[PDB]
Amino acid sequence: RIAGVDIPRDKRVVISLTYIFGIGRTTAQQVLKEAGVSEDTRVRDLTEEELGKIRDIIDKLKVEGDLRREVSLNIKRLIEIGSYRGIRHRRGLPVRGQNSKNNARTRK
């Protein structure tokens, strides 16, 4: 697959492409705005000239590994420079600014 990980062949055009890491719903709409494929066809049933225009737009964006690097780069950045928000990423506690006596069960 273009992302290196598949889309299911029977879903619609927008939502199958949202399984691509880094690509959500509104990122899919900007691509298909440039593609112009009406967004409701079987993605088992396309042409490659149609899908070659799908490829190079994905080639233009931070999609597969690059978006996996740079946030993990930022995690490795801010922890190793102190930077208290680094410690909240570090210990297993919330980051964005919350209390602590309450639930916070996404991180312990």
């Binding site: 950045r77 420079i81 102190g82 930077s83 208290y84 928000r85 680094g86 410690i87």
Partner: protein, 78 residues
């Protein structure tokens, strides 16, 4: 903030321009946790007040975009 520039207090900009003009020198007890970090501050060590003491910290080429309040552990835990 958004477009007013990164915020500094007048005393912080004063002594660091006295620091940058001649030579790097002793640490500075700031009480301005609230202030940002400018790219001129690199290599300047300063003392941030934590609530009960001024903790000395370092500024490198990576600790640039944030404020000074990222380096003030005010709530110690175990």
């Amino acid at each position: 903030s958004l477009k007013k520039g990164p915020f500094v207090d007048g005393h912080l900009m004063t002594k660091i321009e006295k620091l940058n003009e001649t030579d790097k020198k002793q640490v500075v007890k700031t009480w301005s946790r609230r202030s940002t970090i400018f790219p001129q501050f690199i290599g300047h060590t300063i003392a941030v007040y934590d609530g009960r003491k001024h903790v000395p910290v370092f500024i490198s080429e990576d600790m640039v975009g944030h404020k000074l309040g990222e380096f003030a552990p005010t709530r110690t835990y175990k």
